[PDB]
Design a protein around this ligand. Structure first.
Ligand SMILES: CC(=O)N[C@@H]1[C@@H](O)[C@H](O[C@@H]2O[C@H](CO[C@H]3O[C@H](CO[C@H]4O[C@H](CO)[C@@H](O)[C@H](O)[C@@H]4O)[C@@H](O)[C@H](O[C@H]4O[C@H](CO)[C@@H](O)[C@H](O)[C@@H]4O)[C@@H]3O)[C@@H](O)[C@H](O[C@H]3O[C@H](CO)[C@@H](O)[C@H](O)[C@@H]3O[C@@H]3O[C@H](CO)[C@@H](O)[C@H](O)[C@H]3NC(C)=O)[C@@H]2O)[C@@H](CO)O[C@@H]1O
Ligand code: NAG
Ligand code: ZN
Length: 1014
């Protein structure tokens, strides 16, 4: 395996280094506003060296944005596709590329057989070419790599089945900045080329000047270069026609033949297109070829890409005609006039890349190597697109919840073949497709109209319900004696209990386990562990009595803690935010121990009095002017006091100190160690009163954040043997620090209410000497080194925090792990901050035509890990990556893939079993089975199961960490007949594996395997 820590890769362009060197001056470059006046030598091209030009027609189709998916389909996309089919069929030389398979699949499914065959023919003959072939063109900032892969696989699996094609070129013209997670996944999915567009205008200028817009994009840790993917960055401000023909949009706009008037479009530069005629074709060609030759100056080969399209283009037959006929007249003239030395034609994206590499192999070009990312994007001036790292955070959190439910449903149901009547495949396809759709660059990004956000939410809720159904049917089958198992495939044998979604104070959604002498003495519950190692985790359930005890399914007592159910209320009479306790419902908490990829059953039993193995938390309400807080049968009376500093320790874990406002002030790791200053603070950013306004996309703060005025908040302290917590009702946030013996969990119930033009940030202040360095993750896959740059505005220093961030010095590290993607930064040495929500009155002139005023309460979840790192083997100062410790990685897993909890619905579970998966291998902590998916329906003689295995890289810090078993996924199911290494989409077999043994992957690597079973 490659060493991902100790070898700094040697690349021609390293983005962090480039950022350090660049001046980012925003000067008027002339007609190319953000470039310079391009000059070319007319003698560069001649009879023996022509410029080959590929004009590639396209239509960007958003699967929801200002209309819903279905609205756009009915109003626009179905017409675009119908007319593409007609026009390509009738015009053999015309070409078209298509990206969004969600739309194509819908369209194709609805076609009659005659037209299906016509469609297959224009694909087979190369006129219509699929680019990327994902369900959507995903966001690259907020999306988790697992969901990027999910959506890619959904689109490509459809394409292989129905169109018999698998794209090897990717087209990403629209995401708001670009992540190296894309080439990582694409290169491991058979791709050979990719194209990107939305990168900072200063980066475009810098790379264009050096002819570094085409590069071999490798991962930041990759010393050898085996991850490299050829990447083409487009040079100009937009992917529209005015910004794709060459540097002067006043000229290029004249070659968008939809802009002459009858279509309701015009040219901003006030010179319209004119129909090409015999009397103007020479002058028109002069102008166009001059633009092309200028654009060609920015690249290294004699092969030029000219995209021809825009959003929802090619809708009407007349538009197809007007573009095609005019371009054909230009081609006929240009190609026949030797003096131009140009050969121009309609082409596809693959045709462009094939020609580029032909030129490369002929020895006419060598390409630079590059590592890094392309965040944070700015399209002009100081307009940095860091707002969408946070916009609509409820749905960003929902994404991560659904991500896990899809994984768990696919895994739990994979163990068996299911009858068609069970509707397992149907429900899983629904769930995968809704989650995939949300990866769209107007979905998870929070940049859609309110009614479209509501549509995505409804789709995701349906998907969650589908997952639940599949999960609970699977648990019932896995844990019931086979000769007793009698499934009704519509029945709910278990209900899922989720303690963090939608969350306390967001929705009262969980079911109370109702026990009583005169109703039901006991209840079975089951935990699932999707991770491939034994896991212990505290779990909680609501119960109708505090006198409940827990046993395992050997009837062994399990230590438990009972706590009250606390709900916070904004009291509109007293004008205070204060907690109320239930007098009929209680929380029972205990440690569940669950096999790798397995299930464990426990029993909750009522008694008339305090059980031997159950303890009760104390509760202390700190406020001036307290009133009584009765708790029914709960055996411990609530205590009251004036606000004061408090200190808590659970188990042998850290000791946490809190201010009188209930906010963390210090962490003491051990009994003898220092009280390390770690302060939580809430602040607010505002909006500018002049100039450009923040909106769904842009973050344009009116200076540094100002502290939120806290007043005298009510603080609730719960102290238990297993779990303790401090909660405080702040303006807009109920902030909760939870201690279970390791790194604390932080929960924020964020309700920005009616606070207009406000962004609420949570900041951590420490004395860690981090300087200008911090680390943030990319798509939950890797941690990249960031440098705060004072030459850039505050909003430019904001990055996506899709799963975590950290700061460190020689001795100490503070890591904040997240359960939802949000924006964040380190704006000063020793600080971390992460945006919670934003409510914005104005539009930011990027097309949405609304602000963000549809905020709703959301429960954000985090883990906070303070660690000593003086003993850790870390990358050198010049290495662009960082790596988590074991504790931080496990903390991230606790947020993203918690235990699943099931409550048996009926009174008695006949044939119940105690455990599933006790014999599953417990793999090394850095290895995950990211995907387990049965690929075949029940009628297949040879069953196939697909696995995606990911190994992260954790720092070596002196912990021996011994005794784990080799995980061979190909032997997880019995009767294996073959094992193949495949592309990550499972669509191509790459290696036939000897002994039918799937070898474990290297650090930072991801591999897919398919086992076949007789
Ligand atoms: C529907 C419609 O007809 N809209 C027109 C607006 O487009 C137009 O406003 C201008 O929008 C340009 C961007 O348009 C493209 O993006 C739209 C947004 O959707 C896509 O992006 C969003 C993110 O932004 C993303 O979420 C989503 O998924 C999607 O991918 C899209 O709707 C547009 O397409 C529609 O309209 C065009 C015609 O306009 C049709 O051809 C399409 O088929 C479709 O109906 C486009 O794809 C912005 O670039 C414009 O800003 C420039 O211009 C204004 C002046 O108007 C300046 O103030 C700005 O500074 C900016 O100037 C540019 O600056 C750079 C850098 O200096 C220069 O290099 C460049 O040359 C400058 N351009 C100009 C013109 O000076 C603008 O906001 C308005 C036109 O007034 O009319 C409609 O509302
Ligand atoms: C599918 O494509 C493969 C290779 O691209 C080809 O060999 C095969 O004939 C095709 N099958 C059809 C026509 O469905
Ligand atoms: Zn778009």
């Amino acid at each position: 395996c490659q060493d991902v820590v100790q070898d700094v890769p040697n690349v021609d362009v390293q983005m962090l280094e480039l950022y350090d060197r660049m001046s980012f001056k925003d000067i008027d470059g002339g007609v190319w506003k953000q470039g310079w006046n391009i000059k070319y030598d007319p003698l560069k091209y001649n009879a023996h060296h022509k410029l080959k030009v590929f004009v590639v027609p396209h239509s960007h189709n958003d699967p929801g944005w200002i209309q819903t998916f279905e609205e756009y389909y009915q109003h626009d996309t179905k017409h675009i596709l119908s007319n593409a089919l007609r026009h390509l069929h009738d015009n053999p030389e015309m070409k078209f590329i298509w990206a969004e398979i969600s739309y194509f699949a819908r369209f194709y499914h609805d076609l009659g057989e005659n037209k299906k065959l016509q469609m297959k023919s224009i694909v087979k003959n190369g006129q219509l070419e699929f680019v990327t072939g994902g369900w959507v063109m995903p966001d690259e900032a907020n999306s988790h790599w697992r969901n990027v892969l999910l959506q890619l696989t959904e689109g490509q699996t459809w394409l292989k089945q129905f169109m018999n094609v698998t794209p090897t070129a990717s087209w990403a013209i629209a995401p708001f900045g670009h992540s190296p997670t894309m080439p990582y996944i694409l290169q491991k999915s058979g791709f050979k080329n990719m194209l990107i567009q939305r990168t900072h205008y200063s980066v475009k200028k810098e790379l264009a000047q050096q002819r570094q817009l085409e590069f071999l994009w490798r991962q930041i840790w990759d010393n050898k270069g085996d991850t490299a993917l050829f990447t083409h960055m487009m040079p100009f401000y937009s992917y529209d026609i005015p910004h794709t023909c060459g540097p002067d949009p006043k000229v290029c706009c004249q070659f968008d033949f939809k802009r002459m008037g009858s279509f309701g479009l015009s040219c901003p530069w006030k010179v319209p297109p004119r129909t090409i005629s015999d009397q103007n074709v020479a002058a028109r060609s002069d102008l166009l070829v001059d633009q092309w030759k200028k654009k060609a100056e920015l690249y290294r080969t004699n092969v030029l890409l000219i995209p021809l399209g825009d959003d929802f283009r090619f809708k009407q037959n007349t538009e197809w005609d007007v573009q095609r006929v005019n371009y054909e007249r230009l081609f006929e003239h240009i190609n026949s006039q030797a003096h131009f030395n140009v050969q121009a034609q309609f082409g596809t994206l693959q045709e462009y890349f094939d020609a580029v590499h032909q030129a490369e192999r002929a020895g006419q070009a060598e390409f630079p190597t590059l590592s890094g990312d392309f965040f944070t994007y700015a399209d002009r001036s100081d307009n940095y697109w860091s707002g969408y790292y946070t916009s609509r955070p409820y749905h960003k959190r929902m994404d991560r919840v659904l991500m896990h439910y899809v994984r768990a449903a696919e895994m739990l149901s994979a163990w068996h073949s299911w009858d068609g009547m069970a509707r397992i495949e149907e429900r899983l396809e629904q769930a995968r497709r809704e989650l995939s759709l949300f990866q769209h660059h107007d979905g998870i990004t929070g940049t859609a109209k309110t009614h479209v956000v509501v549509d995505y939410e409804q789709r995701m809720q349906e998907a969650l319900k589908a997952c639940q159904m599949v999960m609970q049917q699977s648990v019932y089958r896995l844990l019931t004696k086979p000769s007793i198992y009698s499934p009704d495939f519509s029945f709910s044998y278990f209900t899922l209990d989720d303690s963090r979604w939608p969350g306390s104070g967001v929705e009262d959604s969980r079911t109370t386990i109702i026990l009583g002498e005169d109703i039901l003495p006991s209840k079975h519950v089951v935990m699932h562990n999707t991770l491939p190692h034994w896991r212990e985790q505290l779990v909680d359930f609501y119960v109708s009595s505090p006198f409940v005890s827990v046993t395992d399914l050997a009837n062994n007592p399990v230590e438990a803690q009972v706590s009250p159910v606390w709900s916070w209320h904004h009291d509109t009479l007293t004008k205070t935010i204060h907690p109320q306790g239930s007098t009929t419902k209680y929380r029972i908490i205990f440690k569940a121990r669950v096999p790798p990829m397995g299930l464990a059953t426990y029993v909750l039993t009522i008694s008339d009095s305090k059980p031997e193995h159950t303890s009760y938390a104390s509760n202390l309400l700190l406020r001036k002017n307290p009133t009584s807080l009765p708790l029914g049968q709960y055996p411990e009376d609530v205590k009251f006091g004036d606000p004061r500093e408090i200190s808590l320790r659970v188990g042998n874990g850290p000791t946490l100190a809190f201010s009188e406002q209930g906010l963390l002030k210090s962490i003491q790791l051990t009994q003898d160690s220092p009280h390390v200053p770690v302060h939580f603070k809430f602040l607010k950013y505002g909006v500018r009163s002049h100039g450009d306004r923040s909106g769904a996309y842009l973050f344009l703060p009116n200076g540094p954040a100002s502290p939120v005025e806290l007043g005298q908040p009510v603080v609730l302290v719960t102290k238990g043997k297993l779990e303790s917590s401090v909660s405080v009702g702040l303006p807009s946030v109920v902030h909760q620090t939870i201690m279970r013996g390791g790194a604390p969990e932080i929960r924020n119930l964020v309700d920005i209410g009616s606070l207009d033009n406000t962004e609420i940030v949570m900041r951590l202040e420490t004395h860690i000497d981090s300087g200008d360095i911090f680390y943030t993750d990319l798509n939950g896959l890797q941690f990249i080194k960031r440098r705060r740059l004072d030459k850039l505005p505050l909003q430019a220093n904001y990055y996506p925090i899709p799963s975590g961030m950290f700061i460190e010095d020689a001795n100490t590290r503070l890591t904040l792990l997240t359960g939802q993607p949000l924006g964040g930064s380190s704006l000063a040495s020793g600080e971390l901050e992460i945006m919670q929500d934003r409510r914005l009155a104005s539009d930011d002139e990027r097309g949405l035509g609304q602000g963000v005023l549809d905020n709703k309460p959301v429960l954000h979840i985090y883990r906070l890990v303070l660690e000593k790192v003086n003993n850790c083997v870390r990358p050198s100062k010049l290495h662009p990556a960082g790596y988590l410790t074991s504790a931080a990685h496990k903390a991230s897993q606790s947020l993203l893939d918690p235990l699943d909890k099931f409550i048996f619905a009926e009174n008695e579970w006949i044939g119940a079993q105690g455990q599933f998966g006790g014999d599953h291998p417990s793999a090394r902590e850095d290895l995950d089975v990211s995907v387990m998916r049965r690929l075949t329906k029940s009628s297949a003689k040879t069953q196939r199961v697909g696995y995606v295995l990911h190994r992260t890289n954790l720092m070596q810090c002196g912990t021996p960490e011994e005794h784990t078993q080799k995980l061979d996924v190909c032997h997880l199911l019995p009767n294996v007949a073959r094992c193949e290494r495949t592309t990550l989409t499972f669509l191509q077999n790459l290696e036939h594996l000897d002994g039918m043994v799937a070898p474990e992957v290297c650090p930072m690597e991801t591999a897919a395997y398919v086992s076949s079973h007789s």
